[PDB]
UniProtKB/Swiss-Prot annotation, chain B:
Cellular compartments per GO CC: cytoplasm; cytosol
Protein name (database record): Dihydroorotase
Cross-referenced PANTHER family: DIHYDROOROTASE
Residues reported to bind Zn(2+) 2: K99, H133, H171
One of the protein's GO biological processes: pyrimidine nucleotide biosynthetic process
GO molecular function: dihydroorotase activity; zinc ion binding
The EC number(s) this enzyme carries: 3.5.2.3
Origin species: Yersinia pestis
Subunit composition and interactions: Homodimer.
Gene: pyrC
Amino acid sequence: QPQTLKIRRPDDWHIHLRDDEMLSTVLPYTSEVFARAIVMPNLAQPITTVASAIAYRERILAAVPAGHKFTPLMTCYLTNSLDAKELTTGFEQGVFTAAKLYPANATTNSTHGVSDIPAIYPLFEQMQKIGMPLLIHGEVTDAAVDIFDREARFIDQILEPIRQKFPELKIVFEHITTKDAADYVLAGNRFLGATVTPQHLMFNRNHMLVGGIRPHLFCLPILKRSTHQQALRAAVASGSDRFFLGTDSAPHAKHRKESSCGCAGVFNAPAALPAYASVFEELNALQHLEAFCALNGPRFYGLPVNDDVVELVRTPFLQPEEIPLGNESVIPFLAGQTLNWSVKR
Amino acid sequence: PQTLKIRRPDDWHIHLRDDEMLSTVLPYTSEVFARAIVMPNLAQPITTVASAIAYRERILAAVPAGHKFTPLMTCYLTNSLDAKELTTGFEQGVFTAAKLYPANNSTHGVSDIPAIYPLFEQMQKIGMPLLIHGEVTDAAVDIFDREARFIDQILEPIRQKFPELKIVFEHITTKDAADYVLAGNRFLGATVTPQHLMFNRNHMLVGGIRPHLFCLPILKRSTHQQALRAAVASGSDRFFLGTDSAPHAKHRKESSCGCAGVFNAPAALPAYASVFEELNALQHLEAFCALNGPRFYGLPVNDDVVELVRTPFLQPEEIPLGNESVIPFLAGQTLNWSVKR
Ligand SMILES: [Zn+2]
Ligand SMILES: [Zn+2]
Ligand SMILES: [Zn+2]
Ligand SMILES: [Zn+2]
């Protein structure tokens, strides 16, 4: 009988569900396994009001397959013109679980993002006061800064000053990719946490570029050198409660990935939990998987831990090469590869 | 408009491919360049005099009427290559140089480089230049560090043992390489592509991933780009024009695993002119394009002239290739310089 592992039902603290037909297609891969997910607000029209958040939440709930138990945790897209009252009442009414900071032009659907971050300090002050967490895509966008350096520059230039001025603001440093970030979070306090994706644990920039260029490994923040990958792996393997599961599943149609200018984002929802299990196994750290997947996140946000359990079984499972999307398709993470772990039905 | 008359240039590093691709891409080179160093990495690599002669003939047959062009052939070095094949090829005028590709068996590429030291000794003796793709392949080495490791681990020992061997450090991409060449002597030269002068890795990756800027060796950080620019702008005679034009069909570039190589032949000379202009170094363009290479190899300089004219020049979006196409360097963009023949 193959090795099994019982853990509390996990949550995904960072995901893109998109909208319309894409939403219908991709959500089931998440709702099958995860009880809750932090749903990012970067649609074509960003989610900046309570009304638009309620409407999007309804569309997500309508896409949940029968027999799945799933609750989306909505987020507000911060902007330079955002009204603080909208953020405050959204949080107190339970519409917004958190607010998300995109530096302007840092990534997908970020043209309406925040251009001069210190200008919205009055929003952070209000968030600190009410206990609303701030989620951050932590990259500078200055053209003179090399893409591989943008996360590290963010830490010193933007994040540290925020933490000095608002010491009791809950901040999630989303999808960390560097030793710089890992060390900074490890040296922080209970008000600073971080999510880590499976791709930044499993791969480094050599996988994207050696022997050919692989746009399905292209995501933001970009894959870093092996040194940084190893630091992330050691961070989560340490069992520190500052790190938790956030996939940053970010699906795009195949033709938008395999083009002259490929979109950033990996569609990793289909194999997400098994992928993480494989990593924790390689790190001799399966004892810390549960905390990372199911405990650390809820404890950071101040939300309850799930009552359910899931069973991971160490039996092979082949990822499909493509996932249909109308007359187009989406290429999943680890397409055509065999994972060592499966989830028991 | 401003004009610049220079000696007819040569391209000291090019891939012409073969068959229909060869027919399509060669004219872009033969229109402007009198000679080109033709790399030997075909599907069946060029490792014998016979195969080199045959490939040369196919190239010459593809030269359009009214173009004056001569391909300078190269031998693909392998672990099992016979030294006599190299020697007679050089003396018969078939091989102009030999090319070292680090592997990634002995038929197909050099795996243990010190094992072919006896070939280098023979090349040194006869005056045959060694062209090097200078990257290690060790899996522990990050892709952006591979050029720098090559310098210390492979190139320096070769230069210590064979101090009078002519070596071209092909398509340099790093400050490490630039500084090493600048600190060398007349037996060490280097080619520089337009893409490594014009761009850095941010251009390939910021705001989207751009496989038409993906080439080997990979684009480096801006620091290295600036060092290359300063190297050629200094007017050092150790650097010369080598495009490393490396065309692939569009569908092979824009795929789940894109091929390395930029097709820069169509706008090659105008692109370089733009760079030298930005660097306030147009006085050094002629040497880089037409003098430094021939003088390094010990070959004659071209008698012809070409005129560069500062009038706009729109690059096409696509170049036909049978039922397929090839995306050129700077597709859809406007260069400030054009060539009058
Ligand atoms: Zn992000
Ligand atoms: Zn995201
Ligand atoms: Zn090469
Ligand atoms: Zn080449």
